[PDB]
Amino acid sequence: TYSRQIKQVEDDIQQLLKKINELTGIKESDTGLAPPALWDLAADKQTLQSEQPLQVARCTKIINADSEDPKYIINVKQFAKFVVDLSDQVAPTDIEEGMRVGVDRNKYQIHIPLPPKIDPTVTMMQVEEKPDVTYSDVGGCKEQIEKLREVVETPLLHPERFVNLGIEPPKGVLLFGPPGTGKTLCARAVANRTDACFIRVIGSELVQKYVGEGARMVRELFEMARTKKACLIFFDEIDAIGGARFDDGAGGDNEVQRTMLELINQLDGFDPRGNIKVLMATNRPDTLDPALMRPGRLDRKIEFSLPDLEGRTHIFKIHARSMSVERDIRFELLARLCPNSTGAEIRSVCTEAGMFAIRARRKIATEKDFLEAVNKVIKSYAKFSATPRYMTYN
Amino acid sequence: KGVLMYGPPGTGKTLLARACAAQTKATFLKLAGPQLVQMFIGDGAKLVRDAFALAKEKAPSIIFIDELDAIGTKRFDSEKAGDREVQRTMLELLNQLDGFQPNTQVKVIAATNRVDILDPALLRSGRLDRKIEFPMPNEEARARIMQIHSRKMNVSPDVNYEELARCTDDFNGAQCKAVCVEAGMIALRRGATELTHEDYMEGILEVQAKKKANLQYYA
Amino acid sequence: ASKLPLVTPHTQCRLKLLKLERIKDYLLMEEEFIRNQEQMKPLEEKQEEERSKVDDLRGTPMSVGTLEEIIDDNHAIVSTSVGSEHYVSILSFVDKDLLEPGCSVLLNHKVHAVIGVLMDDTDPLVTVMKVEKAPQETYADIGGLDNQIQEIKESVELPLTHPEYYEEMGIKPPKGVILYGPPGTGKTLLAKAVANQTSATFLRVVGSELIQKYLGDGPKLVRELFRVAEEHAPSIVFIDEIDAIGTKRYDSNSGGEREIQRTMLELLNQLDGFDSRGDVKVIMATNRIETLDPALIRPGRIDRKIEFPLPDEKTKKRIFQIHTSRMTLADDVTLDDLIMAKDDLSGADIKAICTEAGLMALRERRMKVTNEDFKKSKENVLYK
Ligand SMILES: Nc1ncnc2c1ncn2[C@@H]1O[C@H](COP(=O)(O)OP(=O)(O)OP(=O)(O)O)[C@@H](O)[C@H]1O
Ligand SMILES: Nc1ncnc2c1ncn2[C@@H]1O[C@H](COP(=O)(O)OP(=O)(O)OP(=O)(O)O)[C@@H](O)[C@H]1O
Ligand SMILES: Nc1ncnc2c1ncn2[C@@H]1O[C@H](COP(=O)(O)OP(=O)(O)O)[C@@H](O)[C@H]1O
Ligand SMILES: [Mg+2]
Ligand SMILES: [Mg+2]
Ligand SMILES: [Mg+2]
Structure with missing residues (x-):
C-alpha cells in the first residue's frame, strides 16, 4: 500500500549517507593520495621528524676492506669509487665485503648494510600460495606416489629416521x-602438503635474449635457495632447457646448452647445495642429456604409465563422485571400454556426459548417457588421441 | 703445465x-664453465685475466676449470x-695461459666429459699437457667403490662384494654409489636394522630403471 | 559506499521498512558524533588546512621514480630516473597498498622521499589486442550450420549466462574449443558472432604474430598475453590461424625450428599449467589440423573439437538469401543456376560473387543487378 512511502524514505537516507560523508573527507578522487583520516600520525610531528632530521642515505656497493684500518673501498652505479668510513651507530662486524650499504650525500660514510639484489624475475617464481589438489585426487597410481613421497617429504618431516640409520637420502627425482x-x-599435491619454500620453474622462462643471461638466473635461483633451510625446486618441461650437446658445423643451439651446463654445476661438485631437493617433470625423456640423467642429480626415475584396469575404475570414482547420477550405473563396464586411455580423457568423459543431461532437460545422467559420451570422446576423437606417438617418446 | x-x-x-683441494695447502681456485660468459663485451675477457693475475699473486696456486666445453x-x-663473443674469452684463455710472456707458477686442471666438441687449439701440447682419461670401472673397482660408501651403514657379514660387483655391470661411480643409498632405504621400509644381500639386489633394480610390463611368459 | 548488500524481501514488507530505518539511525548517530568534533575542537578547517599542510610539505617539483623493493618500516629503495638509486623514507599519506616493484611513484625534490604513487598509463599492447566494440550482426547472419552453433554456446555463452545448469549437475564446463x-x-x-553476444572482454591474436625476431621474445609474449587475460575479468582468448606457427619459416626469426618449439612449450603450459587458472576461455581456429602438435590438442587443454564441412546445396541457397538480402535484386536472375556452378564453392565464394556483381553495376551507374552481372561475375571470381 505504501508504495512510494517506503521508496522515497529509502532514497533520501541513501542520499543522506553521501551528503555528510562528503563533509568528512574521503572525497577528491586522487592521483595517488591516501584516505584523509588515516595519515594523522604524520600530520604535524613526523612530517617534521621523518623529514627534517632524517636524510637520504644514497645506497652503494662495497668492493673491499683493507688491513690495519677501516678504509673501505666503495662503489656506486655510474659515478666514481671512494674511500669511506663507518658511522658510530654500527659495528665493523657486518660490513663484510661485497655488500650493499647506505651512504650519506656529503661525507660519504656508511650508515647501514642492505639485503642483496634478488633480480625480480626470480622473485615472481616463488609460489607463496598453495593449490587445492590432495593426494586423494591422484588415484590409480598409489605405488608411484609412495615411491615419490618417501623422497620429498619424509626426510623433511622426520629427519631422524635417516640420520640415525646413517644414510644420506636421495635428493633429485624426475617424473615422466x-x-x-x-x-x-601429482606435483600440485606435493606443494599442497609441504611446508618449505616451493620455488617453481617452467623451463621456457630461462631462454633469454642476451648471451649468458639465462645462466645467471640459474645462479640467483640457487643463491636464494641456499639461504633457506629446506627448499623444493620444481622444474617443468625441461626438454626446453636442454636436450643434448650435438654441435656440428655452424654452432646452433649453443646458447641454451650453456644454461644447461650451469644447471648441472649447481647440482653436483664443489661444496654442494646441501638441503635443496629438485623435482623435474618431462614429456619425452629420450632427448635428455646423459650427464643430466646421472644419479646424484636425478636419482629416482618414477614412471607414469597408463592405468591398467583398477587404476581406471578408481579415476571414474574421483571425477564422478560429485555429480548427479543414476544410482544403478556400473563403472567397471566403462573402464573395460577405454583400453589405453589417460586420466585426462576419463575426466573429459565425465564432463561430457553431464552435458547430454543438460542437452534435453534432465537433472541426472543415465548409463546410456555415459555410452553416448564414450564413443564420442574415445572412438570419435580417435583421429587425434595424442598418445600413440608418445608411448615411443618420439 | x-x-x-x-x-x-x-x-x-x-x-x-x-681430493687435491684437501691435500695441498696452496691457493686453490675454482671456476665454472659458463661463468666466463657475460652480456657486455669484454667482461668475460677481463674476468679471465683477473683470475690469472690473482693466481699470479699467490705464487703457490693451482687453478681449476670445470665443464670446459x-x-x-x-x-x-x-x-x-x-656467436663470436664466446670465442673472445677462449682466445684470451689460450693466450693468457700460453704464448707471449709465459710463466711457471700456476697449474691448470681442466675437466670435461666430451672431447670432440673442443677446439684443437687448446689441446695442442703446451697449453694442456697431460690428457688422462677416466674409464668405466672394470670389475674389481666396482667391488671397491661400493665398499667405500657402505662404510657407515650397518651391514651384516652376508655380503659378497665380488658377487655384487659382478651383478652390476655397465655401471659407473655414481650408479655404484646409488645402489648403496637405495639398499639403505629398502631396509628402512621393512623395518630391518642390518643390510642383507637381497637388499642390494633390489636396489639394483631401482637404479637400472626397468619398465614393468607383465612379462612372465618366457622360458 | 557498500553500506549494506541486503535487498532480499523485494516487497512492501515492514522488514525492508525496518532495516532501512535502522540504517537511518546508524547514519545520523554517526553524523551527530562527528558533528561534535569541530564544535569542541575546531582547530582547522579540515577541508583544505590538512590538505594545504600536505601540499606545502610536498614540493612543487615532483620527480617521478620507480620502486624496486619495499622494507615495511616506511623506507624503501627507489630508483631515480638516471639510474642512481636511493634509500629514502616513505610518508604516511602514501596509502601503502598500491606499491608493487616497478610501479611509478612520486618523490621529493630535496630528500627524494616517497610522497605519492602514480596511476599507470597502460598500455600500447593491451589496447592492440582488446576488441573495443561488437563487430557485426548476430547469429542470424550465419545460416546453415545449426549444429555447431549450439556447440559453441554450450561451451562459452551458456556457462556465462546461466551458471545454474552446471551446479545442479555438479560439473565444470568444458575448457577448450578448436574449430x-x-x-x-x-x-x-x-x-564474430560470439564477440557480438558476450559480455566478457574479448582478446584476439593471430597465430602468425606469435613468432618474433629476438631470442626468448616469443615465449615472453605468451606469458604476458595470459597475464592480461586473467587480470581483467571473465574473458575470451581467440587465437586464429595457429597452424601458421609451424608451417611457414621466416628468416626474421633468429632461432630456427627450435625456437618455435620453445614458444609452443610456453603455450602448452598456459593452457594447462599447475597455476590456478581462473575464468579464461580459449577459442582456437585453423585449417591444417593435422600439422600441429597433438600434445596441445589433448583433453585437458582443448575439450571440444568442432569440424566445419563444405556447404550443402540446400544450405548454399540459404547463403544467397543472406548476402542478397538488402540489395535491389532484379527478377532476371535465378539463384539455383548459381548454386551448382562450382560443385564445392565455399561460403566465402558466395559473398565474393555477390559483392563483385554489385561492382559491375556501378560501372554502368545502375541500381539493380541483372543476370549478366552474375554471368561475368563467376568468370571473374572463380576462373582465373
Ligand atoms: N590419476 C589421475 N587421477 C585423476 N585425474 C587425473 C589423473 N591423471 C591425470 N588426471 C587429470 O589430468 C589433468 C592434469 O594432467 P597433467 O597436466 O598432470 O598431464 P601431464 O601428465 O602433466 O602431461 P602434460 O605435461 O602434457 O600436461 C587433470 O585435469 C587431472 O584431472
Ligand atoms: N556458412 C556461412 N554463412 C554465412 N556466411 C559465410 C559462411 N561461410 C562463409 N561466409 C562468408 O565468408 C567470409 C569469410 O568467412 P571466414 O573467414 O570466417 O571463413 P574461415 O574458414 O574463417 O576463413 P579462413 O579459413 O581463411 O580463416 C565471411 O565474411 C562470411 O561472410
Ligand atoms: N672410486 C670412485 N670412482 C668413481 N666415482 C666415484 C668413486 N667414489 C665416488 N664416486 C662418485 O663419483 C661422483 C663424482 O662425480 P663425477 O663423475 O666427477 O662427475 P663429472 O665427472 O660429471 O663431473 C661422486 O658423486 C661420487 O659419489
Ligand atoms: Mg664436474
Ligand atoms: Mg577465416
Ligand atoms: Mg603437464
Missing part, C-alpha cells in the same frame, strides 16, 4: 610419461 | 679435484649469423 |  597422465597434477 | 681429465660422466672427475667449443666460419 | 575445416567455411565468422 605420456601427456595427460598426471605428472603436473 | 696443464692437465686434462676426460671420460664418461660418472667416473669421478670432481672427486680428484676435491661451455667456452671451449670449436670455432667455425659462418656468414649471416653465429 | 577446423576447409578454408573459407566460416571459422572466423562464427567468432
Whole structure:
C-alpha cells in the first residue's frame, strides 16, 4: 500500500549517507593520495621528524676492506669509487665485503648494510600460495606416489629416521610419461602438503635474449635457495632447457646448452647445495642429456604409465563422485571400454556426459548417457588421441 | 703445465679435484664453465685475466676449470649469423695461459666429459699437457667403490662384494654409489636394522630403471 | 559506499521498512558524533588546512621514480630516473597498498622521499589486442550450420549466462574449443558472432604474430598475453590461424625450428599449467589440423573439437538469401543456376560473387543487378 512511502524514505537516507560523508573527507578522487583520516600520525610531528632530521642515505656497493684500518673501498652505479668510513651507530662486524650499504650525500660514510639484489624475475617464481589438489585426487597410481613421497617429504618431516640409520637420502627425482597422465597434477599435491619454500620453474622462462643471461638466473635461483633451510625446486618441461650437446658445423643451439651446463654445476661438485631437493617433470625423456640423467642429480626415475584396469575404475570414482547420477550405473563396464586411455580423457568423459543431461532437460545422467559420451570422446576423437606417438617418446 | 681429465660422466672427475683441494695447502681456485660468459663485451675477457693475475699473486696456486666445453667449443666460419663473443674469452684463455710472456707458477686442471666438441687449439701440447682419461670401472673397482660408501651403514657379514660387483655391470661411480643409498632405504621400509644381500639386489633394480610390463611368459 | 548488500524481501514488507530505518539511525548517530568534533575542537578547517599542510610539505617539483623493493618500516629503495638509486623514507599519506616493484611513484625534490604513487598509463599492447566494440550482426547472419552453433554456446555463452545448469549437475564446463575445416567455411565468422553476444572482454591474436625476431621474445609474449587475460575479468582468448606457427619459416626469426618449439612449450603450459587458472576461455581456429602438435590438442587443454564441412546445396541457397538480402535484386536472375556452378564453392565464394556483381553495376551507374552481372561475375571470381 505504501508504495512510494517506503521508496522515497529509502532514497533520501541513501542520499543522506553521501551528503555528510562528503563533509568528512574521503572525497577528491586522487592521483595517488591516501584516505584523509588515516595519515594523522604524520600530520604535524613526523612530517617534521621523518623529514627534517632524517636524510637520504644514497645506497652503494662495497668492493673491499683493507688491513690495519677501516678504509673501505666503495662503489656506486655510474659515478666514481671512494674511500669511506663507518658511522658510530654500527659495528665493523657486518660490513663484510661485497655488500650493499647506505651512504650519506656529503661525507660519504656508511650508515647501514642492505639485503642483496634478488633480480625480480626470480622473485615472481616463488609460489607463496598453495593449490587445492590432495593426494586423494591422484588415484590409480598409489605405488608411484609412495615411491615419490618417501623422497620429498619424509626426510623433511622426520629427519631422524635417516640420520640415525646413517644414510644420506636421495635428493633429485624426475617424473615422466605420456601427456595427460598426471605428472603436473601429482606435483600440485606435493606443494599442497609441504611446508618449505616451493620455488617453481617452467623451463621456457630461462631462454633469454642476451648471451649468458639465462645462466645467471640459474645462479640467483640457487643463491636464494641456499639461504633457506629446506627448499623444493620444481622444474617443468625441461626438454626446453636442454636436450643434448650435438654441435656440428655452424654452432646452433649453443646458447641454451650453456644454461644447461650451469644447471648441472649447481647440482653436483664443489661444496654442494646441501638441503635443496629438485623435482623435474618431462614429456619425452629420450632427448635428455646423459650427464643430466646421472644419479646424484636425478636419482629416482618414477614412471607414469597408463592405468591398467583398477587404476581406471578408481579415476571414474574421483571425477564422478560429485555429480548427479543414476544410482544403478556400473563403472567397471566403462573402464573395460577405454583400453589405453589417460586420466585426462576419463575426466573429459565425465564432463561430457553431464552435458547430454543438460542437452534435453534432465537433472541426472543415465548409463546410456555415459555410452553416448564414450564413443564420442574415445572412438570419435580417435583421429587425434595424442598418445600413440608418445608411448615411443618420439 | 696443464692437465686434462676426460671420460664418461660418472667416473669421478670432481672427486680428484676435491681430493687435491684437501691435500695441498696452496691457493686453490675454482671456476665454472659458463661463468666466463657475460652480456657486455669484454667482461668475460677481463674476468679471465683477473683470475690469472690473482693466481699470479699467490705464487703457490693451482687453478681449476670445470665443464670446459661451455667456452671451449670449436670455432667455425659462418656468414649471416653465429656467436663470436664466446670465442673472445677462449682466445684470451689460450693466450693468457700460453704464448707471449709465459710463466711457471700456476697449474691448470681442466675437466670435461666430451672431447670432440673442443677446439684443437687448446689441446695442442703446451697449453694442456697431460690428457688422462677416466674409464668405466672394470670389475674389481666396482667391488671397491661400493665398499667405500657402505662404510657407515650397518651391514651384516652376508655380503659378497665380488658377487655384487659382478651383478652390476655397465655401471659407473655414481650408479655404484646409488645402489648403496637405495639398499639403505629398502631396509628402512621393512623395518630391518642390518643390510642383507637381497637388499642390494633390489636396489639394483631401482637404479637400472626397468619398465614393468607383465612379462612372465618366457622360458 | 557498500553500506549494506541486503535487498532480499523485494516487497512492501515492514522488514525492508525496518532495516532501512535502522540504517537511518546508524547514519545520523554517526553524523551527530562527528558533528561534535569541530564544535569542541575546531582547530582547522579540515577541508583544505590538512590538505594545504600536505601540499606545502610536498614540493612543487615532483620527480617521478620507480620502486624496486619495499622494507615495511616506511623506507624503501627507489630508483631515480638516471639510474642512481636511493634509500629514502616513505610518508604516511602514501596509502601503502598500491606499491608493487616497478610501479611509478612520486618523490621529493630535496630528500627524494616517497610522497605519492602514480596511476599507470597502460598500455600500447593491451589496447592492440582488446576488441573495443561488437563487430557485426548476430547469429542470424550465419545460416546453415545449426549444429555447431549450439556447440559453441554450450561451451562459452551458456556457462556465462546461466551458471545454474552446471551446479545442479555438479560439473565444470568444458575448457577448450578448436574449430577446423576447409578454408573459407566460416571459422572466423562464427567468432564474430560470439564477440557480438558476450559480455566478457574479448582478446584476439593471430597465430602468425606469435613468432618474433629476438631470442626468448616469443615465449615472453605468451606469458604476458595470459597475464592480461586473467587480470581483467571473465574473458575470451581467440587465437586464429595457429597452424601458421609451424608451417611457414621466416628468416626474421633468429632461432630456427627450435625456437618455435620453445614458444609452443610456453603455450602448452598456459593452457594447462599447475597455476590456478581462473575464468579464461580459449577459442582456437585453423585449417591444417593435422600439422600441429597433438600434445596441445589433448583433453585437458582443448575439450571440444568442432569440424566445419563444405556447404550443402540446400544450405548454399540459404547463403544467397543472406548476402542478397538488402540489395535491389532484379527478377532476371535465378539463384539455383548459381548454386551448382562450382560443385564445392565455399561460403566465402558466395559473398565474393555477390559483392563483385554489385561492382559491375556501378560501372554502368545502375541500381539493380541483372543476370549478366552474375554471368561475368563467376568468370571473374572463380576462373582465373
Ligand atoms: N590419476 C589421475 N587421477 C585423476 N585425474 C587425473 C589423473 N591423471 C591425470 N588426471 C587429470 O589430468 C589433468 C592434469 O594432467 P597433467 O597436466 O598432470 O598431464 P601431464 O601428465 O602433466 O602431461 P602434460 O605435461 O602434457 O600436461 C587433470 O585435469 C587431472 O584431472
Ligand atoms: N556458412 C556461412 N554463412 C554465412 N556466411 C559465410 C559462411 N561461410 C562463409 N561466409 C562468408 O565468408 C567470409 C569469410 O568467412 P571466414 O573467414 O570466417 O571463413 P574461415 O574458414 O574463417 O576463413 P579462413 O579459413 O581463411 O580463416 C565471411 O565474411 C562470411 O561472410
Ligand atoms: N672410486 C670412485 N670412482 C668413481 N666415482 C666415484 C668413486 N667414489 C665416488 N664416486 C662418485 O663419483 C661422483 C663424482 O662425480 P663425477 O663423475 O666427477 O662427475 P663429472 O665427472 O660429471 O663431473 C661422486 O658423486 C661420487 O659419489
Ligand atoms: Mg603437464
Ligand atoms: Mg664436474
Ligand atoms: Mg577465416
